[model samples]
Target: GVPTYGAIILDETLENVLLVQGYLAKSGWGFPKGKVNKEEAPHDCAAREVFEETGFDIKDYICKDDYIELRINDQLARLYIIPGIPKDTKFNPKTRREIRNIEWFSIEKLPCHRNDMTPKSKLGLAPNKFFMAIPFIRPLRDWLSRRFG
Candidate 1:
């Protein structure tokens, strides 16, 4: 059996980052992520999990169909990363049952380390994963920035 994970990156206003606090469950501050369920595609599970955790729908936003995998505990684990969401998109914390809280974090001001990251889990992303991921996201980020920014 393989362990699967998914996550979403939500961009927040620079002015609002300072005011946001206690975002994410267990004081773990990072994009909304979780394991996949039976019969669920990694992307679909990622989107569903993020919506369940942060009350945001990302179907309309930019998403990648490609997937990444890491060898963990003898099983290959996979995940997806969805880039920026539409500005002014609505979020309902009340609907976020899996998440205790949610907030935006600026890329420049990102914490040195995520508060609740597990060593066993690769949320921080290892060097090898980065090597593999860069090829996938570099073009995507560039395309999005050029298209939207």
Candidate 2:
């Protein structure tokens, strides 16, 4: 079965970040994501899921459409970043029906759960769906150098 969803990477500094939580059925620390609503636009679903999972109005962010295949078929998803969210902005778990917790941590740090992706796992992108869209070290640095250097 094919699935579609939205996820957020609320970058705090260039290092730390948080993972949004979900209800028991899907409870865990991860980018705020959920199934796309009926006929909903991908980016719109991303924004809405962010609002539902982590309560903080956001603005001015870039997104990408990436495809990752599952056992049955391919899955489509969009990832976002809130570049201008205020430092003191409140982050409350918004959804009464699904979201459970919203916790922050350093990018170099993460919860001691097997489900969490390791640093190596974070770099690969399935087709166009890159978990870390921005490249990590050598390639990222080279790209940045060409773009802004």
Candidate 3:
């Protein structure tokens, strides 16, 4: 059985996406996400994880049907794309152990290969199973533009 996890994509325009890295782990670079808590809704879990990992309160962000579902390492993953993060909003990861680096990158600037490893790697989704889902970013960005633009 696959464990379920929820993640959130903080986007401003379809081009700008937020990514984070943790100080304790090399594989910690990825969107804010975590395992779903017992009796918790996925979206709610996403919001909570976002706040926990990024210190950005996404409770008021718009979350419609814009989401991505995939199977990574046999784990069920659902990621939501929420647009319109305030430009003035500052991201201070709640704990240093959880996130050490957080930055916004334009779609074109996203990293392409794993060896890039400069903390600039586009998608840092871990466990290796999610590598197959990287190609979906293009279409996902396009869909977000249409759905939330």
Candidate 4:
């Protein structure tokens, strides 16, 4: 957990956000992000990671004040809110070995949390593809409302 940085890239309609599907252990879908590099600034890291993952640079779009940060298990993650990117823009990952695919997903449809399987009233969260992105969903919605409304 070396502190990751990236952006929540939104299409012009603001209905969709870009996501990257990773390979192997990271097989689940998540926003484009990567660990911060030595001596790299946060915004720089975000831009570099986003560009590498989606083939779209976020440096010019990043707003210093518009970002969401989360800490889980003592690790920190910060993602800038990048809006108004055209949906039609083509995206290709720089490293196919890490990123398998890139896509735009409906923000309202993405789940904020996983469902629990009630096996005779047993409590357990079921497997979910969006688990990696789940924690940021509600927060993103809240941010959008507060910022846009």
How much lDDT does each candidate structure score?
A: 0.47, 0.50, 0.64, 0.91
Query: TM-score for every candidate vs. truth?
Result: 0.52, 0.59, 0.72, 0.96
- Expressed as tens digits, the lDDT of each residue in 1-149 for candidate 4 is 79999989898888999899998889999988899989999999999999888888888788999999999888999999999999989999898889988889999999998998786687889889988899999999999998887
Sorting all predicted structures by lDDT, with the top scorer first, yields 4, 3, 2, 1
* Count of clashing pairs, candidate 1: 1
- The number of the candidate with the highest lDDT is 4
Which model, 1 or 3, shows the larger TM-score? 3
lDDT of 2: 0.50
> By TM-score, highest first, what's the ranking?
4, 3, 2, 1
> Predicted candidate 3: what Cα RMSD to the true structure?
6.2
lDDT of 4: 0.91
> Residue 146 error for model 1, in Å?
12
- TM-score of predicted structure 4: 0.96
* Total clashing pairs in model 4: 0
lDDT of 3 by residue, 92-141 (tens): 87767766777775667554443444476565443442233354466666
The ten-residue window of minimal lDDT in model 3 covers 124-133
Which stretches of candidate 1 lie above 4 Å from their native place? 10-25, 65-79, 94-97, 112-149
lDDT of 2 at 59: 30
